[PDB]
Design a protein around this ligand. Structure first.
Ligand SMILES: Cc1cn([C@@H]2OC[C@H](OP(=O)(O)OP(=O)(O)OP(=O)(O)O)[C@H]2O)c(=O)[nH]c1=O
Ligand SMILES: [Ca+2]
Ligand SMILES: [Ca+2]
Length: 427
DNA sequence: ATAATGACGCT
DNA sequence: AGCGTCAT
């Protein structure tokens, strides 16, 4: 009877990251309702991050800045920096690399996003156990940790609830048994208290964190108490936690697959997936799905913390929505070159920082109408990091899709240009 | 007219 | 390889 408590895994999530990045750069933005915005033209810009002060008014991501200034008129606005006509997030990627470095010290991480890392803390927690002489774990070692499920049984202050739940946990603790899963979860947690404290001391950035036995519980744990907090979710808390957890809130169940688990099976919460046999599930959703599903509703999952703190593709895209769609040869060529240019700037910096080289160029477009994010996608070779070579070669491998005899103009209008660098190798 | 960006499965 | 899914 295996129960998926082999590993200790954490998901670190920087809190309102871009907002934190701007606020470190611009002290006026601190302790204030503010938001990051890109492209001022259309309705003031689309809001891509929201400080917690501004959330309290109702302001959300993707929302237009002119609309959100209706909800919050005191909303300050850091514009994203524009470069060659495209929104340029270099500031954040640099900010992210600062944090991934600190995290790289404490253990072996997987860059999830600009904002997130998974951390496999298993070997690190074994190392620290013998380095405490099996002596207890002080509450003071966990000043921002929550214990999902606790406090239980037989208090109005939010932090007062936190101590009770941590005190119940530390009390129930089997610290003589140096292989107790619940004890590990607790040691990894103190480590995360530390790595989170190191991130803040050394960059100024606060973050939230989830600690558990796999990537999926960690991510879910990480959302339980934000910001500047961390949740520990132990095996035994899974049944109650999943008891009313909506299925779509689990990483990979947020799209169509998860939708139909609700549809086919007629449930609505994650715990309800227990009652089915694995063959039942494989039969509804496939061999690998019914398997992963059957273990997941039992809180067991085994996708590993792949050690890969760097991405595997480098991509530069630009959207031309509505009346801005490109419809001329001269337009398409100009953007292919603008994208090619930031691309070589990112590419060159990759060749010297991370010591490697992309070898294939992928070109993608998307036309007016087609609801697929990508209408076309074609692979051509990538030899020198030369912006002009890449533009021309991109145009080459997509020239055969301007279905208008008039070569001056371009139909259908293109609503997207994507240039992605892949197939890296040593350098 | 939610934009940029990225990992992976399927075939 | 080319498309579809999913997440951030
Ligand atoms: C959903 C979504 C997110 N992001 C960004 O990827 C990292 C971060 O993700 P996040 O949700 O964590 O944003 P955030 O303000 O840090 O929110 P909280 O950490 O306070 O929850 C957000 O900066 C996108 O680029 N596109 C997206 O479609
Ligand atoms: Ca975040
Ligand atoms: Ca994130």
């Amino acid at each position: 009877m295996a129960t998926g408590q082999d590993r200790v895994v954490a998901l670190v999530d920087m809190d309102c990251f871009f907002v934190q990045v701007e606020q470190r750069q611009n002290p006026h933005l601190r302790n204030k309702p503010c938001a990051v915005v890109q492209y001022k033209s259309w309705k003031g810009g689309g809001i891509i991050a929201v400080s917690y002060e501004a959330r309290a008014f109702g302001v959300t991501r993707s929302m237009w800045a002119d609309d959100a200034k209706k909800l919050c008129p005191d909303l300050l606005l850091a514009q994203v920096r524009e470069s060659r006509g495209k929104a340029n997030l270099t500031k954040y990627r640099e900010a992210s690399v600062e944090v991934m470095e600190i995290m790289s010290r404490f253990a072996v991480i997987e860059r999830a996003s600009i904002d997130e890392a998974y951390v496999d803390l298993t070997s690190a927690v074994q190392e620290r156990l013998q380095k405490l002489q099996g002596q207890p774990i002080s509450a003071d070692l966990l000043p921002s940790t929550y214990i999902e499920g606790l406090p239980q049984g037989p208090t109005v202050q939010k932090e007062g609830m936190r101590k009770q739940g941590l005190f119940q946990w530390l009390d129930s603790l089997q610290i003589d048994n140096l292989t107790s899963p619940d004890l590990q979860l607790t040691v990894g947690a103190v480590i995360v208290e530390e790595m989170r404290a190191a991130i803040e001391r050394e960059t100024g950035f606060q973050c939230s964190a989830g600690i558990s036995h796999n990537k999926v519980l960690a991510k879910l744990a990480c959302g339980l108490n934000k910001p500047n907090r961390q949740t520990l979710v132990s095996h035994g808390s899974v049944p109650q936690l999943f008891s009313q957890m909506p299925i779509r809130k689990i990483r990979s169940l947020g799209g169509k697959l998860g939708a139909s688990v609700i549809e086919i099976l007629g449930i609505e919460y994650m715990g309800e997936l227990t009652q089915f046999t694995e063959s039942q599930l494989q039969s509804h959703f496939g061999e690998k799905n019914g398997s992963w599903l059957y273990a997941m509703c039992r809180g067991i999952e085994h996708d590993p913390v792949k050690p890969r703190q760097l991405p595997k593709t480098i991509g530069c895209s630009k959207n031309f929505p509505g009346k801005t769609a490109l419809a001329t040869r001269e337009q398409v060529q100009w953007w292919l070159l603008q994208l090619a240019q930031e691309l070589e700037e990112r590419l060159t910096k990759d060749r010297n920082d991370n010591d490697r080289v992309a070898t294939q160029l992928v070109v993608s477009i998307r036309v007016q109408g087609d609801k697929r994010l990508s209408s076309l996608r074609r692979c051509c070779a990538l030899t020198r990091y030369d912006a002009h070579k890449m533009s021309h070669d991109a145009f080459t491998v997509i020239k055969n899709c301007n279905t208008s005899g008039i070569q001056t103009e371009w139909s259908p209008p293109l609503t997207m240009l994507f240039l992605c660098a892949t197939k890296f190798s040593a350098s």
